[PDB]
Amino acid sequence: GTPVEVTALYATDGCVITSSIALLTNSLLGAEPVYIFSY
């Protein structure tokens, strides 16, 4: 049908900003699993 829109508030064990930046830059050295606390 049509895509369902989801807003996910997420967290990580460690520095969330550093992990997000590593994910965005494709530099897979600081990326860690993301836990979706709320949606």
Side-chain angles (χ1 to χ4, degrees):
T2 287
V4 162
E5 317 279 321
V6 177
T7 309
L9 174 84
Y10 76 102
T12 304
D13 288 320
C15 188
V16 64
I17 281 293
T18 318
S19 319
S20 308
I21 300 318
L23 267 159
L24 283 176
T25 62
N26 213 27
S27 151
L28 301 110
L29 295 303
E32 319 167 350
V34 303
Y35 301 110
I36 288 175
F37 197 38
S38 272
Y39 67 99

